[PDB]
Amino acid sequence: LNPESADLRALAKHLYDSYIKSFPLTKAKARAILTGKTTDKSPFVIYDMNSLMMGEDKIKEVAIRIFQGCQFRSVEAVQEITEYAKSIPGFVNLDLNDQVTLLKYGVHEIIYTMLASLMNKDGVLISEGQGFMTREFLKSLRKPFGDFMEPKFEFAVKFNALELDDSDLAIFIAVIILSGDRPGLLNVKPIEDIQDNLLQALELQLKLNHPESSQLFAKLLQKMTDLRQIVTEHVQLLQVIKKTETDMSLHPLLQEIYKDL
């Protein structure tokens, strides 16, 4: 109903379109799988060691093998997030060093945001929705691996209570990427100008898509604080594993992201 609000609607639709093309497992598909809907197939459930071995047939010790699988999927997600970032208007026109800095510090916050879409209080979807690993099984793994996912479930349960959908999440993750407060940025003003447009589009999106949810925009921005805490704790646990497991190797792409965080 306004020239400016029409541009914000166009930006919201552009990003939702790019989000669908970049991320193969959407929140809508994940919910259809988690709530037994007829549009998708039921997953094989891994709740103990026997189901894990039968799951490896259907779909290093156990804990390290699961940890390696998570880091493989995180590498895949970095690739998907990088592809999505390039579709955000203005992102590819930024200084190349700043594009790398924004992704270095942004990918982990986005991974945990999108991981919540695959989670409920009972567990997490794996193998592109083919499987489901229980929260209790992950918590039963030998230390320090049994503590890696628990804080992610705590965040996911709170974040999922906002009931965001894919069109909401597309603009939210773009806002996370264009954060002008990352360490080492050379040209902050161009980044903040883009983030302002994205925040304007996110605000209008949440008002139209959730007309009964008061201050959902503020509640969602307050979750960006929960995401930082999760990222910091995750890095601390990786340092513990680095010294305890001299045999374990971390992917080069993930190695560069963690350096000097």
Author numbering: 204 to 262, 275 to 476
From the publication, what sentences describe this entry?
We hypothesized that the absence of hyperglycemia in mice treated with MTX-531 stems from the molecule’s unique ability to act as an agonist of the nuclear hormone receptor PPARγ. Time-resolved fluorescence resonance energy transfer (TR-FRET) competitive binding assays showed MTX-531 to be a weak agonist of PPARγ (IC50 = 2.5 μM) and inactive against PPARα and PPARδ at concentrations as high as 100 μM. The intracellular effects of MTX-531 on PPARγ activity were evaluated in reporter gene assays carried out in 293H cells, where agonist activity was shown against PPARγ (EC50 = 3.4 μM) with significantly less potency compared to rosiglitazone (EC50 = 14 nM). We next sought to generate an X-ray crystal structure of MTX-531 bound to PPARγ to provide structural evidence for their interaction. The three-dimensional complex of PPARγ and MTX-531 was solved from crystals diffracted to 1.9-Å resolution. Clear electron density at the compound-binding site revealed binding of the entire compound, allowing an unambiguous placement of the ligand. The final solved structure contains two molecules of PPARγ (chains A and B) and one molecule of MTX-531 bound to chain B. The PPARγ ligand-binding region is known to be a large, mostly hydrophobic cavity capable of binding a wide variety of small molecules. The quinazoline core of MTX-531 appears to sit in a pocket of PPARγ formed by stacking of the aliphatic side chains of L330 and R288. The functional groups at the 6-position quinazoline core in MTX-531 bind at a site distinct from the orthosteric pocket that binds rosiglitazone. Our working hypothesis is that the agonistic activity of MTX-531 against PPARγ counteracts PI3K-driven hyperglycemia.
Here we evaluated the pharmacological profile of MTX-531 that was computationally designed to selectively target two key resistance drivers, epidermal growth factor receptor and phosphatidylinositol 3-OH kinase (PI3K). MTX-531 exhibits low-nanomolar potency against both targets with a high degree of specificity predicted by cocrystal structural analyses. Here, we show that MTX-531 acts as a weak agonist of peroxisome proliferator-activated receptor-γ, an attribute that likely mitigates hyperglycemia induced by PI3K inhibition. The reversed binding mode of the quinazoline core between EGFR and PI3Kγ was an important element in the design of MTX-531, which shows low-nanomolar potency against both of its intended targets.
